[PDB]
Design a protein around this motif. Structure first.
Motif, mmCIF file in Angstrom:
data_model
loop_
_atom_site.group_PDB
_atom_site.id
_atom_site.type_symbol
_atom_site.label_atom_id
_atom_site.label_comp_id
_atom_site.label_asym_id
_atom_site.label_seq_id
_atom_site.Cartn_x
_atom_site.Cartn_y
_atom_site.Cartn_z
ATOM 1 N N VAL A 141 0.860 -1.177 0.000
ATOM 2 C CA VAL A 141 0.000 0.000 0.000
ATOM 3 C C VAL A 141 0.898 1.230 0.000
ATOM 4 O O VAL A 141 1.615 1.489 0.973
ATOM 5 N N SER A 142 0.862 1.992 -1.089
ATOM 6 C CA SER A 142 1.685 3.184 -1.201
ATOM 7 C C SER A 142 1.012 4.370 -0.517
ATOM 8 O O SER A 142 -0.198 4.382 -0.275
ATOM 9 N N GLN A 143 1.821 5.381 -0.207
ATOM 10 C CA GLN A 143 1.312 6.582 0.433
ATOM 11 C C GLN A 143 0.415 7.361 -0.531
ATOM 12 O O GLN A 143 0.282 7.032 -1.714
ATOM 13 N N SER A 144 -0.202 8.414 -0.005
ATOM 14 C CA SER A 144 -1.165 9.203 -0.759
ATOM 15 C C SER A 144 -0.451 10.271 -1.578
ATOM 16 O O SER A 144 0.379 11.019 -1.050
ATOM 17 N N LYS A 145 -0.779 10.336 -2.870
ATOM 18 C CA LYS A 145 -0.259 11.405 -3.715
ATOM 19 C C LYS A 145 -1.033 12.701 -3.501
ATOM 20 O O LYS A 145 -0.446 13.789 -3.520
ATOM 21 N N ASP A 146 -2.344 12.600 -3.296
ATOM 22 C CA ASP A 146 -3.155 13.770 -2.996
ATOM 23 C C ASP A 146 -2.807 14.309 -1.612
ATOM 24 O O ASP A 146 -2.423 13.565 -0.706
ATOM 25 N N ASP A 148 -4.804 16.263 0.728
ATOM 26 C CA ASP A 148 -5.821 16.074 1.756
ATOM 27 C C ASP A 148 -6.530 14.729 1.649
ATOM 28 O O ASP A 148 -7.706 14.619 2.025
ATOM 29 N N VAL A 149 -5.850 13.704 1.142
ATOM 30 C CA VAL A 149 -6.324 12.326 1.187
ATOM 31 C C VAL A 149 -5.358 11.540 2.061
ATOM 32 O O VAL A 149 -4.139 11.621 1.874
ATOM 33 N N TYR A 150 -5.898 10.793 3.019
ATOM 34 C CA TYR A 150 -5.094 10.094 4.012
ATOM 35 C C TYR A 150 -5.256 8.591 3.842
ATOM 36 O O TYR A 150 -6.380 8.079 3.846
ATOM 37 N N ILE A 151 -4.132 7.893 3.694
ATOM 38 C CA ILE A 151 -4.105 6.446 3.520
ATOM 39 C C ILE A 151 -3.173 5.855 4.569
ATOM 40 O O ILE A 151 -2.030 6.303 4.711
ATOM 41 N N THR A 152 -3.658 4.855 5.296
ATOM 42 C CA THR A 152 -2.846 4.172 6.290
ATOM 43 C C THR A 152 -2.204 2.927 5.688
ATOM 44 O O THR A 152 -2.683 2.364 4.701
ATOM 45 N N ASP A 153 -1.102 2.500 6.300
ATOM 46 C CA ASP A 153 -0.450 1.270 5.882
ATOM 47 C C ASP A 153 -1.359 0.076 6.167
ATOM 48 O O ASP A 153 -2.337 0.170 6.916
ATOM 49 N N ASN A 182 -10.656 5.603 -7.189
ATOM 50 C CA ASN A 182 -9.309 6.119 -7.396
ATOM 51 C C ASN A 182 -8.623 6.479 -6.083
ATOM 52 O O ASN A 182 -7.615 7.193 -6.096
ATOM 53 N N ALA A 183 -9.144 6.000 -4.951
ATOM 54 C CA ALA A 183 -8.524 6.312 -3.667
ATOM 55 C C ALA A 183 -7.144 5.678 -3.550
ATOM 56 O O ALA A 183 -6.228 6.271 -2.969
ATOM 57 N N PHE A 184 -6.974 4.476 -4.099
ATOM 58 C CA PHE A 184 -5.702 3.765 -4.069
ATOM 59 C C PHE A 184 -5.053 3.704 -5.450
ATOM 60 O O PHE A 184 -4.372 2.730 -5.780
ATOM 61 N N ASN A 185 -5.259 4.742 -6.266
ATOM 62 C CA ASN A 185 -4.688 4.751 -7.609
ATOM 63 C C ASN A 185 -3.168 4.823 -7.579
ATOM 64 O O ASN A 185 -2.510 4.367 -8.521
ATOM 65 N N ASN A 186 -2.594 5.384 -6.519
ATOM 66 C CA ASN A 186 -1.147 5.498 -6.398
ATOM 67 C C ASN A 186 -0.495 4.223 -5.872
ATOM 68 O O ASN A 186 0.690 4.249 -5.524
#
Lengths: 197, 246
Positions: A141-146, A148-153, A182-186
């Motif tokens: 799981v890669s970090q967020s490119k956006d 103000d979008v937050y993605i946890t490991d 597209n939340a996990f597009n990165n």
């Protein structure tokens, strides 16, 4: 000087191998510690002379001629995921700790079912939550490119009563155009990832 | 086998003040040490506390900055003098060496989590929200995953736990190991934290089951002055809950 390494990944059920080396040949005592992210270091076992020493699923190996100490974890479980520290006592009473080796025992996903679900909105929150779950342990799981979008490991939960483990990553944002498609597009997600409408 | 008691557990202090943490052992142990460690980093020894004299400080740590006093074998205090935000860390106490049960290895105490801020007005409690499981996950896997978000808290002094029908549960629960910064470039960024509780679809679809996400926040104390219209960010529990539904 006591030398550990860094981050290590071991499959669930396999033997986790943790080794450290020391400079002082006059060292007399060697210790292994297990430390979780929040807690303080906990002594798991110790060894004073050459050979192996078993204590359940733990095995401590010491070779003072080759100046290394080893910790073998047999039948490793995801609950073994922690930082393991090696401590060496010199000719006196001074302990020299190592940097520690972070261990990650990834679970075996027998039936991978990768999907990204949108959880029900909370009336008390302005955020939309997406759940990337049930993918196998080889997906990163890669970090967020956006901004103000937050993605946890990724996180490993164990439904013990059902003997079922699964990976999961959470993505949330309060933007009006934020969508789980597209939340996990990165990230490099599997091609057969289920995207329910 | 020696029991090490550190006080206090954690504390939020202003920049420029001093905090005297302590360490007490139930039995007489010869060697005693003070460690500093940030979450995720490596354990770095500060000094070795000698009884009735100055402590032997490692390279980088000086006595005027970290005064250490060890009256007897079972008691020692560390004072972080003229505190700066760079001194924010978890301060560990370690004891070992010869005792009545012999030469025992070094065991650690529970540590003192020290947060040092430029201004105590930046202390905020978390906003906790529970997100009910997706219907698509329920029909596709027969499993329902709840997600809890604790956002906008500072510093990172939170303890997340799940409670089902009044009983704290650990099965099917995974919380992030460390909170993430909401604006990583900013040095004053508040933190967010996610956690998942996964149950069988039939258990979630029982409207008699109660699901609560409890987040224990450790903030200011009574003696800490607070002059703001906002509610005083004391040590408190912020929660969000949801019932089952079919």
């Amino acid at each position: 000087v006591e030398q550990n390494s860094g981050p290590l990944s071991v499959p669930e059920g396999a033997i986790a191998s943790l080794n450290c080396t020391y400079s002082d040949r006059g060292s007399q005592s060697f210790f292994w510690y297990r430390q979780y992210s929040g807690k303080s270091p906990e002594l798991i076992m110790f060894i004073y002379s050459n050979g192996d020493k078993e204590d359940g699923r733990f095995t401590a190996q010491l070779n003072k001629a080759s100046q290394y100490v080893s910790l073998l974890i047999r039948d490793s479980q995801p609950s073994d995921s922690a930082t393991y520290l090696c401590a060496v006592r010199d000719a006196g009473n001074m302990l020299t700790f190592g940097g520690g080796t972070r261990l990650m025992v990834k679970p075996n996903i027998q039936n991978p079912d990768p999907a990204v679900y949108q959880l029900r909105d909370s009336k008390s929150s302005d955020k939309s939550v997406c759940l990337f779950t049930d993918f196998d342990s080889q997906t990163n799981v890669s970090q967020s490119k956006d901004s103000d979008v937050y993605i946890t490991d990724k996180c490993v939960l164990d439904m013990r009563s059902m003997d079922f483990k699964s990976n999961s990553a959470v993505a949330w944002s309060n933007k009006s155009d934020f969508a789980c498609a597209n939340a996990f597009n990165n990230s490099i997600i599997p091609e057969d990832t289920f995207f329910p409408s | 086998s020696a029991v090490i008691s550190q006080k206090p557990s954690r504390d939020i202090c202003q920049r420029g003040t001093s905090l005297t943490i302590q360490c007490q052992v139930d039995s007489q142990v010869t060697m005693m040490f003070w460690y500093r460690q940030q979450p995720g980093q490596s354990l770095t020894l500060i000094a070795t506390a000698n009884q009735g004299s100055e402590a032997t400080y490692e390279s980088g740590f000086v006595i005027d900055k970290f005064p250490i006093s060890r009256p007897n074998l079972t008691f020692s205090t560390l004072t972080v003098s003229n505190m700066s935000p760079e001194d924010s860390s978890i301060y560990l106490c370690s004891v070992g060496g010869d005792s009545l049960i012999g030469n025992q290895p070094q065991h650690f105490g529970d540590g003192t989590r020290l947060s040092i801020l430029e201004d105590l007005k930046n202390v905020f409690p978390p906003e906790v929200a529970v997100f009910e499981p997706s219907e698509a996950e329920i029909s596709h896997t027969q499993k329902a995953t709840l997600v809890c978000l604790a956002t906008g808290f500072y510093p990172d002094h939170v303890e997340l736990s799940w409670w089902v029908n009044g009983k704290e549960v650990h099965s099917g629960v995974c919380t992030d190991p460390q909170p993430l910064k909401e604006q990583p470039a900013l040095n004053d960024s508040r933190y967010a934290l996610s956690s998942r509780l996964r149950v069988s679809a039939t258990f979630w679809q029982n409207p008699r089951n109660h699901f609560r996400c409890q987040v224990q926040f450790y903030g200011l104390s009574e003696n800490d002055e607070w002059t703001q219209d906002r509610a005083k960010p004391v040590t408190q529990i912020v929660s969000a809950e949801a019932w089952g539904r079919a």
